[PDB]
């Protein structure tokens, strides 16, 4: 239920840029670019993410095993 | 009854009519009684001499007529007749090369696991004598270490009939292994590598691989394309199954209370 | 005494001694139910050293490997190494241009998910002992 609210906040921001970009209510400008930097801030996968993740997943794993 | 023992076999066999009569001879023998119990009774072993002999001549006819599914069909029932439980059975002198037909055939279709498990049934005929069985096991020995060329050179030495329907498929399933070694991403060679690796200074076989495959002789150069893969890997993409794999750990710790 | 003196000849590249073993101790080999070794172990007489070389060296010339495997010809040294890699003796590879038989990549067997596979095997067996023990222990 920490993740069931993730899409719940997201389904609200879903409907906002549906009904403002579809063409009903007048656009704010402040909320638009304040939403823009969110999409240019999410991490991606890379080789540096790759070799590091299995470096410390294994290290967490050894304690369990 | 007692139907056409050596009608069109000892001289020449171009006929299919006596093959239909051997089919009728198969109808006469397998409606005599049976071959299943074989309790005693040398008198019912009398037609067992006949039934094995007429399937020897059916096996000789099967390889002569260039027929793949029927050759193993008669040979299995021949092997079923050397699967006799009560085997008094004086030795029919065609047995060893008859096995050598099957032993060479089953080498040819790459049944190498079935090749060596068939070899159990011979006590001393593999080594002491019997060039008919000694020829495929010396052949299979030549396929082991590095010795491709001795197979292609000792083709021209057969004690029996020429074994032609076996050996040509046998060499063809060696050619694709040399091909499958040379069909790699190793790009270009010349016609003299075709003579060394593939075979045959200027053959019709270079026209064969020109039309079947590529390998076209350009400016004295064969072009084999890159058979190299692309390897698209992330390998963190086992993230769902790895998150799954953690769950049944804690599940199997709990849940039995 | 047969089998230790057998593998004594196998590790060496000798064959006239190896056939001398066969004539000396064939009766015991026939008694043990192992006729079949002579057709199948003469394969690995050449495959022992080429695994030994590809374990020792890293990037060998195929001209040099012919004398080292006493092969008496540099040209079929492509073919044995082709038989080794196609059957998977060594994970090496041939450059068919100037004689290279080069070996594998650098050892990367910690940061490439492989320690997780062995660690999953030891989870799935050890706690399986745990659950089988708890059920088997309490009968009353």
Tab-separated table of C-alpha atoms in Angstrom:
chain	number	residue	atom	x	y	z
A	1	UNK	CA	0.000	0.000	0.000
A	2	UNK	CA	3.033	2.224	-0.258
A	3	UNK	CA	2.899	1.383	-3.948
A	4	UNK	CA	-0.898	1.352	-4.225
A	5	UNK	CA	-0.747	5.074	-3.551
A	6	UNK	CA	2.073	5.592	-6.058
A	7	UNK	CA	-0.209	5.103	-9.026
A	8	UNK	CA	-3.028	6.761	-7.041
A	9	UNK	CA	-1.106	10.035	-6.982
A	10	UNK	CA	-0.131	9.243	-10.561
A	11	UNK	CA	-3.719	8.598	-11.698
A	12	UNK	CA	-4.512	12.069	-10.396
A	13	UNK	CA	-1.653	13.642	-12.328
A	14	UNK	CA	-2.832	11.408	-15.173
A	15	UNK	CA	-6.220	13.106	-15.256
A	16	UNK	CA	-4.858	16.643	-14.887
A	17	UNK	CA	-2.765	16.686	-18.058
A	18	UNK	CA	-5.552	14.790	-19.739
A	19	UNK	CA	-8.121	17.510	-19.097
A	20	UNK	CA	-5.735	20.465	-19.535
A	21	UNK	CA	-3.943	19.177	-22.638
A	22	UNK	CA	-7.094	17.736	-24.166
A	23	UNK	CA	-8.379	21.287	-24.167
A	24	UNK	CA	-10.839	22.143	-21.447
A	25	UNK	CA	-9.521	24.379	-18.723
A	26	UNK	CA	-6.920	27.178	-19.076
A	27	UNK	CA	-3.349	26.007	-18.664
A	28	UNK	CA	-1.209	26.981	-15.758
A	29	UNK	CA	2.351	27.577	-16.830
A	30	UNK	CA	3.959	27.054	-13.414
A	31	UNK	CA	2.905	23.414	-12.992
A	32	UNK	CA	4.022	22.431	-16.500
A	33	UNK	CA	7.769	22.945	-16.318
A	34	UNK	CA	7.699	22.004	-12.635
A	35	UNK	CA	6.453	18.660	-13.946
A	36	UNK	CA	9.039	18.648	-16.733
A	37	UNK	CA	12.151	18.275	-14.574
A	38	UNK	CA	10.641	15.175	-12.938
A	39	UNK	CA	10.890	13.257	-16.202
A	40	UNK	CA	14.443	14.504	-16.705
A	41	UNK	CA	15.486	13.264	-13.293
A	42	UNK	CA	14.665	9.548	-13.243
A	43	UNK	CA	17.664	7.194	-13.309
A	44	UNK	CA	18.382	4.783	-16.118
A	45	UNK	CA	20.199	1.500	-16.382
A	46	UNK	CA	23.861	1.486	-17.387
A	47	UNK	CA	26.999	-0.580	-16.965
A	48	UNK	CA	27.886	1.371	-13.829
A	49	UNK	CA	24.477	0.537	-12.411
A	50	UNK	CA	24.947	-3.047	-13.622
A	51	UNK	CA	28.230	-4.195	-12.069
A	52	UNK	CA	27.487	-2.272	-8.875
A	53	UNK	CA	24.055	-3.818	-8.290
A	54	UNK	CA	25.323	-7.386	-8.462
A	55	UNK	CA	28.308	-6.327	-6.369
A	56	UNK	CA	26.093	-5.526	-3.400
A	57	UNK	CA	23.081	-7.747	-4.043
A	58	UNK	CA	25.508	-10.666	-3.728
A	59	UNK	CA	26.941	-9.072	-0.588
A	60	UNK	CA	23.449	-8.834	0.894
A	61	UNK	CA	22.825	-12.381	-0.314
A	62	UNK	CA	25.838	-14.008	1.387
A	63	UNK	CA	24.568	-13.015	4.847
A	64	UNK	CA	21.239	-14.715	4.140
A	65	UNK	CA	22.603	-17.848	2.507
B	1	UNK	CA	4.706	-72.405	-50.577
B	2	UNK	CA	8.488	-72.534	-51.265
B	3	UNK	CA	8.102	-69.489	-53.472
B	4	UNK	CA	10.877	-68.168	-55.763
B	5	UNK	CA	13.999	-68.806	-53.716
B	6	UNK	CA	16.628	-67.357	-56.087
B	7	UNK	CA	14.477	-66.138	-58.969
B	8	UNK	CA	15.829	-62.668	-59.758
B	9	UNK	CA	18.553	-62.134	-57.163
B	10	UNK	CA	21.612	-64.247	-57.986
B	11	UNK	CA	21.934	-62.942	-61.553
B	12	UNK	CA	20.408	-59.426	-61.521
B	13	UNK	CA	17.682	-57.561	-59.621
B	14	UNK	CA	16.171	-54.638	-61.554
B	15	UNK	CA	12.652	-55.903	-60.844
B	16	UNK	CA	9.916	-54.687	-58.533
B	17	UNK	CA	7.505	-57.513	-59.415
B	18	UNK	CA	9.331	-60.141	-57.353
B	19	UNK	CA	9.514	-57.510	-54.608
B	20	UNK	CA	5.728	-57.723	-54.646
B	21	UNK	CA	6.090	-61.500	-54.689
B	22	UNK	CA	8.461	-61.340	-51.715
B	23	UNK	CA	5.640	-59.318	-50.149
B	24	UNK	CA	3.443	-62.295	-50.982
B	25	UNK	CA	6.193	-64.488	-49.553
B	26	UNK	CA	5.982	-62.365	-46.397
B	27	UNK	CA	2.256	-63.118	-46.386
B	28	UNK	CA	2.896	-66.853	-46.629
B	29	UNK	CA	5.517	-67.043	-43.864
B	30	UNK	CA	3.801	-64.793	-41.321
B	31	UNK	CA	0.619	-66.779	-41.852
B	32	UNK	CA	2.379	-70.114	-41.276
B	33	UNK	CA	2.210	-69.903	-37.509
B	34	UNK	CA	4.187	-67.316	-35.574
B	35	UNK	CA	7.686	-66.559	-34.336
B	36	UNK	CA	6.824	-65.439	-30.780
B	37	UNK	CA	7.141	-68.440	-28.316
B	38	UNK	CA	10.017	-70.525	-29.824
B	39	UNK	CA	9.844	-73.159	-27.094
B	40	UNK	CA	11.678	-76.111	-28.643
B	41	UNK	CA	10.795	-77.816	-31.918
B	42	UNK	CA	13.646	-77.843	-34.430
B	43	UNK	CA	10.879	-78.624	-36.966
B	44	UNK	CA	9.473	-75.123	-36.442
B	45	UNK	CA	13.064	-73.887	-36.481
B	46	UNK	CA	13.119	-75.212	-40.062
B	47	UNK	CA	11.108	-72.291	-41.412
B	48	UNK	CA	13.112	-70.067	-39.051
B	49	UNK	CA	16.018	-70.938	-41.315
B	50	UNK	CA	13.765	-69.936	-44.224
B	51	UNK	CA	12.321	-66.791	-42.623
B	52	UNK	CA	15.747	-65.378	-41.788
B	53	UNK	CA	17.090	-66.221	-45.247
B	54	UNK	CA	14.223	-64.528	-47.084
B	55	UNK	CA	14.712	-61.399	-44.995
B	56	UNK	CA	18.427	-61.484	-45.740
B	57	UNK	CA	17.464	-61.378	-49.410
B	58	UNK	CA	14.924	-58.682	-48.572
B	59	UNK	CA	17.696	-56.713	-46.893
B	60	UNK	CA	19.940	-57.118	-49.944
B	61	UNK	CA	17.046	-55.929	-52.100
B	62	UNK	CA	16.351	-52.999	-49.774
B	63	UNK	CA	19.822	-51.490	-50.023
B	64	UNK	CA	19.927	-52.196	-53.763
B	65	UNK	CA	16.735	-50.218	-54.416
B	66	UNK	CA	17.824	-47.059	-52.481
B	67	UNK	CA	15.159	-47.115	-49.775
B	68	UNK	CA	15.808	-45.584	-46.344
B	69	UNK	CA	12.754	-46.427	-44.088
B	70	UNK	CA	12.360	-49.965	-45.375
B	71	UNK	CA	16.028	-50.904	-44.966
B	72	UNK	CA	15.905	-50.338	-41.215
B	73	UNK	CA	12.471	-51.988	-41.195
B	74	UNK	CA	13.733	-55.352	-42.432
B	75	UNK	CA	17.007	-55.047	-40.508
B	76	UNK	CA	15.166	-54.610	-37.204
B	77	UNK	CA	13.208	-57.810	-37.785
B	78	UNK	CA	16.445	-59.522	-38.787
B	79	UNK	CA	17.882	-58.283	-35.495
B	80	UNK	CA	14.676	-59.548	-33.875
B	81	UNK	CA	15.496	-62.950	-35.351
B	82	UNK	CA	18.939	-62.790	-33.783
B	83	UNK	CA	16.941	-61.791	-30.681
B	84	UNK	CA	15.851	-65.435	-30.545
B	85	UNK	CA	15.340	-66.647	-26.989
B	86	UNK	CA	15.974	-70.356	-27.682
B	87	UNK	CA	18.801	-70.049	-30.183
B	88	UNK	CA	20.098	-73.422	-31.334
B	89	UNK	CA	20.305	-71.887	-34.784
B	90	UNK	CA	23.318	-72.950	-36.895
B	91	UNK	CA	25.167	-69.912	-38.145
B	92	UNK	CA	23.825	-68.212	-41.253
B	93	UNK	CA	27.074	-66.922	-42.808
B	94	UNK	CA	25.580	-63.571	-43.927
B	95	UNK	CA	25.136	-62.223	-40.380
B	96	UNK	CA	28.365	-60.293	-39.873
B	97	UNK	CA	28.224	-58.148	-42.974
B	98	UNK	CA	24.472	-57.753	-42.395
B	99	UNK	CA	25.282	-56.144	-39.056
B	100	UNK	CA	28.020	-54.181	-40.817
B	101	UNK	CA	25.384	-52.754	-43.140
B	102	UNK	CA	23.408	-51.586	-40.102
B	103	UNK	CA	26.522	-50.542	-38.183
B	104	UNK	CA	27.660	-48.358	-41.079
B	105	UNK	CA	24.140	-47.024	-41.741
B	106	UNK	CA	23.566	-46.014	-38.146
B	107	UNK	CA	26.945	-44.299	-38.118
B	108	UNK	CA	25.856	-42.399	-41.214
B	109	UNK	CA	22.748	-40.786	-39.721
B	110	UNK	CA	24.755	-39.670	-36.643
B	111	UNK	CA	23.355	-42.185	-34.152
B	112	UNK	CA	26.706	-42.357	-32.409
B	113	UNK	CA	25.124	-43.179	-29.037
B	114	UNK	CA	23.291	-46.044	-30.705
B	115	UNK	CA	26.518	-46.949	-32.532
B	116	UNK	CA	28.493	-47.933	-29.457
B	117	UNK	CA	25.626	-49.559	-27.567
B	118	UNK	CA	25.086	-51.910	-30.500
B	119	UNK	CA	28.739	-53.050	-30.339
B	120	UNK	CA	28.180	-54.918	-27.056
B	121	UNK	CA	26.866	-58.096	-28.705
B	122	UNK	CA	30.138	-59.250	-30.293
B	123	UNK	CA	32.602	-61.106	-28.023
B	124	UNK	CA	35.736	-61.266	-30.175
B	125	UNK	CA	34.715	-60.560	-33.793
B	126	UNK	CA	35.607	-56.874	-33.399
B	127	UNK	CA	39.345	-57.442	-32.996
B	128	UNK	CA	40.325	-60.997	-33.950
B	129	UNK	CA	38.776	-61.156	-37.432
B	130	UNK	CA	35.706	-59.930	-39.347
B	131	UNK	CA	36.766	-56.970	-41.470
B	132	UNK	CA	33.036	-56.280	-42.081
B	133	UNK	CA	32.654	-55.129	-38.459
B	134	UNK	CA	36.276	-54.016	-38.218
B	135	UNK	CA	35.711	-51.485	-41.024
B	136	UNK	CA	33.135	-49.217	-39.258
B	137	UNK	CA	34.832	-49.332	-35.852
B	138	UNK	CA	38.156	-48.424	-37.435
B	139	UNK	CA	36.193	-45.758	-39.311
B	140	UNK	CA	34.599	-44.439	-36.107
B	141	UNK	CA	38.053	-44.430	-34.518
B	142	UNK	CA	39.214	-42.187	-37.363
B	143	UNK	CA	36.407	-39.711	-36.639
B	144	UNK	CA	37.638	-39.362	-33.052
B	145	UNK	CA	41.031	-37.751	-32.802
B	146	UNK	CA	41.778	-35.481	-35.751
B	147	UNK	CA	41.661	-37.806	-38.680
B	148	UNK	CA	39.227	-36.508	-41.267
B	149	UNK	CA	41.413	-37.288	-44.269
B	150	UNK	CA	41.970	-41.001	-43.560
B	151	UNK	CA	38.191	-41.472	-43.811
B	152	UNK	CA	38.194	-39.912	-47.277
B	153	UNK	CA	41.288	-41.869	-48.328
B	154	UNK	CA	40.218	-45.279	-46.976
B	155	UNK	CA	36.862	-44.957	-48.738
B	156	UNK	CA	38.308	-46.874	-51.678
B	157	UNK	CA	38.788	-50.136	-49.770
B	158	UNK	CA	35.723	-52.280	-49.022
B	159	UNK	CA	35.767	-56.071	-48.542
B	160	UNK	CA	32.068	-56.297	-49.484
B	161	UNK	CA	29.994	-54.518	-52.123
B	162	UNK	CA	30.841	-50.843	-52.397
B	163	UNK	CA	28.575	-49.611	-49.498
B	164	UNK	CA	27.786	-46.656	-51.742
B	165	UNK	CA	24.395	-45.671	-50.315
B	166	UNK	CA	25.950	-45.512	-46.845
B	167	UNK	CA	29.258	-43.764	-47.514
B	168	UNK	CA	27.986	-40.868	-49.640
B	169	UNK	CA	25.545	-39.766	-46.956
B	170	UNK	CA	28.352	-40.569	-44.495
B	171	UNK	CA	30.771	-38.222	-46.211
B	172	UNK	CA	28.052	-35.602	-46.731
B	173	UNK	CA	27.432	-35.508	-42.995
B	174	UNK	CA	31.176	-34.933	-42.629
B	175	UNK	CA	31.157	-32.102	-45.202
B	176	UNK	CA	28.596	-30.028	-43.294
B	177	UNK	CA	30.676	-30.356	-40.114
B	178	UNK	CA	33.669	-28.978	-42.021
B	179	UNK	CA	31.197	-26.446	-43.436
B	180	UNK	CA	29.734	-25.666	-40.006
B	181	UNK	CA	33.286	-25.107	-38.810
B	182	UNK	CA	34.006	-22.836	-41.805
B	183	UNK	CA	30.568	-21.143	-41.929
B	184	UNK	CA	31.659	-19.011	-38.952
B	185	UNK	CA	32.136	-15.220	-38.986
B	186	UNK	CA	35.738	-15.744	-40.162
B	187	UNK	CA	35.168	-13.740	-43.278
B	188	UNK	CA	37.182	-14.609	-46.349
B	189	UNK	CA	39.318	-17.417	-47.727
B	190	UNK	CA	40.453	-18.407	-51.202
B	191	UNK	CA	39.853	-21.381	-53.481
B	192	UNK	CA	42.945	-23.164	-52.151
B	193	UNK	CA	41.334	-23.185	-48.700
B	194	UNK	CA	38.354	-24.832	-50.367
B	195	UNK	CA	40.748	-27.521	-51.606
B	196	UNK	CA	42.368	-27.947	-48.180
B	197	UNK	CA	39.431	-27.497	-45.822
B	198	UNK	CA	36.341	-28.245	-47.877
B	199	UNK	CA	37.945	-30.493	-50.567
B	200	UNK	CA	38.454	-30.977	-54.285
B	201	UNK	CA	40.570	-28.966	-56.699
B	202	UNK	CA	38.287	-27.559	-59.279
B	203	UNK	CA	35.094	-29.593	-58.816
B	204	UNK	CA	31.430	-29.335	-59.567
B	205	UNK	CA	31.218	-29.007	-55.762
B	206	UNK	CA	32.402	-25.394	-55.915
B	207	UNK	CA	29.398	-24.794	-58.169
B	208	UNK	CA	27.308	-26.740	-55.642
B	209	UNK	CA	28.195	-24.448	-52.747
B	210	UNK	CA	27.908	-21.432	-55.058
B	211	UNK	CA	24.237	-22.231	-55.693
B	212	UNK	CA	23.315	-23.800	-52.345
B	213	UNK	CA	25.239	-21.401	-50.098
B	214	UNK	CA	27.130	-18.239	-51.029
B	215	UNK	CA	30.952	-18.635	-51.073
B	216	UNK	CA	31.094	-17.165	-54.574
B	217	UNK	CA	34.528	-16.989	-56.201
B	218	UNK	CA	34.989	-13.284	-56.818
B	219	UNK	CA	38.450	-11.846	-57.546
B	220	UNK	CA	40.018	-15.145	-56.412
B	221	UNK	CA	38.319	-14.809	-53.032
B	222	UNK	CA	35.434	-16.500	-51.263
B	223	UNK	CA	33.101	-14.295	-49.227
B	224	UNK	CA	31.586	-15.931	-46.159
B	225	UNK	CA	29.345	-13.496	-44.313
B	226	UNK	CA	29.557	-12.731	-40.599
B	227	UNK	CA	27.699	-15.350	-38.559
B	228	UNK	CA	28.287	-13.202	-35.465
B	229	UNK	CA	25.507	-12.545	-32.963
B	230	UNK	CA	24.588	-9.157	-31.481
B	231	UNK	CA	24.345	-10.029	-27.731
B	232	UNK	CA	21.721	-7.523	-26.458
B	233	UNK	CA	22.307	-7.726	-22.710
B	234	UNK	CA	21.221	-5.758	-19.675
B	235	UNK	CA	21.285	-8.721	-17.240
B	236	UNK	CA	19.672	-6.636	-14.493
B	237	UNK	CA	16.496	-7.498	-16.433
B	238	UNK	CA	16.401	-10.577	-14.211
B	239	UNK	CA	14.807	-8.156	-11.735
B	240	UNK	CA	11.286	-9.561	-11.620
B	241	UNK	CA	12.404	-13.179	-11.360
B	242	UNK	CA	15.056	-12.148	-8.835
B	243	UNK	CA	12.430	-10.312	-6.805
B	244	UNK	CA	10.287	-13.414	-7.214
B	245	UNK	CA	13.164	-15.637	-6.079
B	246	UNK	CA	13.458	-13.739	-2.797
B	247	UNK	CA	9.742	-14.179	-2.034
B	248	UNK	CA	9.649	-17.977	-1.787
B	249	UNK	CA	12.579	-17.755	0.624
B	250	UNK	CA	10.562	-15.860	3.248
B	251	UNK	CA	7.479	-17.859	2.277
B	252	UNK	CA	9.116	-21.187	3.093
B	253	UNK	CA	10.497	-19.819	6.346
B	254	UNK	CA	7.016	-18.766	7.437
B	255	UNK	CA	3.589	-20.277	6.591
B	256	UNK	CA	4.188	-23.597	8.402
B	257	UNK	CA	3.125	-22.627	11.888
C	1	UNK	CA	48.466	-51.902	-10.748
C	2	UNK	CA	46.660	-51.854	-14.138
C	3	UNK	CA	44.883	-48.530	-13.887
C	4	UNK	CA	47.642	-46.501	-12.260
C	5	UNK	CA	50.074	-47.788	-14.863
C	6	UNK	CA	47.373	-47.085	-17.455
C	7	UNK	CA	46.994	-43.382	-16.638
C	8	UNK	CA	50.781	-43.266	-16.352
C	9	UNK	CA	50.838	-43.836	-20.107
C	10	UNK	CA	47.808	-41.602	-20.718
C	11	UNK	CA	49.453	-38.504	-19.241
C	12	UNK	CA	52.510	-39.156	-21.385
C	13	UNK	CA	52.273	-38.973	-25.157
C	14	UNK	CA	53.428	-42.552	-25.564
C	15	UNK	CA	51.488	-45.179	-27.497
C	16	UNK	CA	53.832	-48.154	-27.938
C	17	UNK	CA	53.853	-48.347	-24.160
C	18	UNK	CA	50.063	-47.937	-24.199
C	19	UNK	CA	49.598	-50.905	-26.521
C	20	UNK	CA	52.040	-52.829	-24.323
C	21	UNK	CA	49.648	-52.202	-21.424
C	22	UNK	CA	46.792	-53.575	-23.530
C	23	UNK	CA	48.647	-56.795	-24.309
C	24	UNK	CA	49.789	-57.104	-20.695
C	25	UNK	CA	46.485	-56.433	-18.935
C	26	UNK	CA	43.790	-57.121	-21.530
C	27	UNK	CA	42.530	-60.169	-19.620
C	28	UNK	CA	41.709	-58.089	-16.551
C	29	UNK	CA	40.135	-55.387	-18.736
C	30	UNK	CA	38.010	-58.075	-20.348
C	31	UNK	CA	37.181	-59.453	-16.904
C	32	UNK	CA	36.086	-56.068	-15.565
C	33	UNK	CA	33.473	-55.482	-18.267
C	34	UNK	CA	35.395	-52.655	-19.939
C	35	UNK	CA	36.241	-53.878	-23.447
C	36	UNK	CA	35.158	-50.508	-24.780
C	37	UNK	CA	38.043	-48.372	-23.462
C	38	UNK	CA	40.348	-49.058	-26.424
C	39	UNK	CA	37.924	-47.517	-28.904
C	40	UNK	CA	37.089	-44.531	-26.676
C	41	UNK	CA	40.248	-43.708	-24.692
C	42	UNK	CA	42.454	-43.417	-27.779
C	43	UNK	CA	40.385	-40.294	-28.488
C	44	UNK	CA	41.590	-38.557	-25.307
C	45	UNK	CA	45.235	-39.507	-25.969
C	46	UNK	CA	45.384	-36.424	-28.182
C	47	UNK	CA	42.703	-34.541	-26.223
C	48	UNK	CA	44.628	-34.599	-22.942
C	49	UNK	CA	47.548	-32.473	-24.087
C	50	UNK	CA	45.500	-30.000	-26.099
C	51	UNK	CA	43.423	-29.366	-22.986
C	52	UNK	CA	46.692	-29.138	-21.047
C	53	UNK	CA	48.174	-26.633	-23.512
C	54	UNK	CA	45.013	-24.524	-23.686
C	55	UNK	CA	45.030	-24.478	-19.892
C	56	UNK	CA	48.709	-23.522	-19.736
C	57	UNK	CA	49.228	-21.141	-22.637
C	58	UNK	CA	47.087	-18.147	-23.517
C	59	UNK	CA	47.734	-17.342	-27.173
C	60	UNK	CA	49.563	-20.105	-29.007
C	61	UNK	CA	50.741	-20.325	-32.584
C	62	UNK	CA	49.228	-23.329	-34.320
C	63	UNK	CA	52.558	-23.898	-36.037
C	64	UNK	CA	54.148	-24.382	-32.618
C	65	UNK	CA	51.400	-26.606	-31.231
C	66	UNK	CA	52.071	-29.257	-33.889
C	67	UNK	CA	55.508	-30.074	-32.496
C	68	UNK	CA	54.281	-29.759	-28.929
C	69	UNK	CA	51.508	-32.280	-29.591
C	70	UNK	CA	54.026	-34.186	-31.831
C	71	UNK	CA	51.371	-33.946	-34.543
C	72	UNK	CA	53.979	-34.061	-37.374
C	73	UNK	CA	51.907	-31.615	-39.497
C	74	UNK	CA	50.918	-27.976	-38.860
C	75	UNK	CA	47.900	-28.064	-41.171
C	76	UNK	CA	45.603	-30.466	-39.297
C	77	UNK	CA	46.284	-28.560	-36.073
C	78	UNK	CA	43.361	-26.441	-37.213
C	79	UNK	CA	41.214	-29.588	-37.271
C	80	UNK	CA	41.970	-30.975	-33.794
C	81	UNK	CA	41.465	-27.550	-32.205
C	82	UNK	CA	38.298	-27.289	-34.299
C	83	UNK	CA	37.223	-30.633	-32.834
C	84	UNK	CA	38.115	-29.397	-29.352
C	85	UNK	CA	36.056	-26.215	-29.525
C	86	UNK	CA	33.097	-27.684	-31.433
C	87	UNK	CA	32.886	-30.430	-28.816
C	88	UNK	CA	33.697	-27.864	-26.131
C	89	UNK	CA	37.054	-28.930	-24.706
C	90	UNK	CA	38.275	-25.336	-24.425
C	91	UNK	CA	36.400	-22.047	-24.844
C	92	UNK	CA	39.292	-20.629	-26.905
C	93	UNK	CA	39.164	-19.535	-30.567
C	94	UNK	CA	41.281	-19.622	-33.721
C	95	UNK	CA	42.287	-16.708	-35.876
C	96	UNK	CA	42.558	-18.406	-39.272
C	97	UNK	CA	44.890	-15.715	-40.568
C	98	UNK	CA	48.295	-16.053	-38.915
C	99	UNK	CA	48.121	-19.003	-36.522
C	100	UNK	CA	46.548	-17.554	-33.377
C	101	UNK	CA	44.689	-19.776	-30.969
C	102	UNK	CA	43.642	-17.108	-28.481
C	103	UNK	CA	41.965	-17.822	-25.158
C	104	UNK	CA	38.919	-16.467	-23.311
C	105	UNK	CA	38.023	-13.078	-21.813
C	106	UNK	CA	39.153	-11.762	-18.398
C	107	UNK	CA	37.743	-13.537	-15.334
C	108	UNK	CA	34.575	-11.721	-14.212
C	109	UNK	CA	32.914	-14.295	-11.995
C	110	UNK	CA	31.816	-12.063	-9.154
C	111	UNK	CA	30.018	-9.039	-10.636
C	112	UNK	CA	28.127	-11.003	-13.291
C	113	UNK	CA	25.223	-12.605	-11.368
C	114	UNK	CA	26.952	-16.040	-11.175
C	115	UNK	CA	27.441	-16.000	-7.342
C	116	UNK	CA	23.659	-15.689	-7.013
C	117	UNK	CA	23.076	-18.995	-8.831
C	118	UNK	CA	25.202	-21.053	-6.462
C	119	UNK	CA	23.762	-19.140	-3.504
C	120	UNK	CA	20.253	-20.084	-4.596
C	121	UNK	CA	21.174	-23.765	-4.749
C	122	UNK	CA	22.396	-23.675	-1.175
C	123	UNK	CA	19.274	-21.872	0.047
C	124	UNK	CA	16.961	-24.333	-1.684
C	125	UNK	CA	18.696	-27.341	-0.153
C	126	UNK	CA	19.542	-26.178	3.364
C	127	UNK	CA	16.139	-24.883	4.427
C	128	UNK	CA	14.656	-27.910	2.687
C	129	UNK	CA	16.505	-29.944	5.310
C	130	UNK	CA	14.911	-27.669	7.920
C	131	UNK	CA	11.342	-28.334	6.842
C	132	UNK	CA	11.956	-32.055	6.392
C	133	UNK	CA	13.511	-32.216	9.849
C	134	UNK	CA	10.658	-30.513	11.711
C	135	UNK	CA	8.029	-32.819	10.225
C	136	UNK	CA	10.141	-35.918	10.806
C	137	UNK	CA	11.109	-35.079	14.362
C	138	UNK	CA	7.788	-34.826	16.188
C	139	UNK	CA	5.873	-38.027	16.006
C	140	UNK	CA	4.224	-37.836	19.430
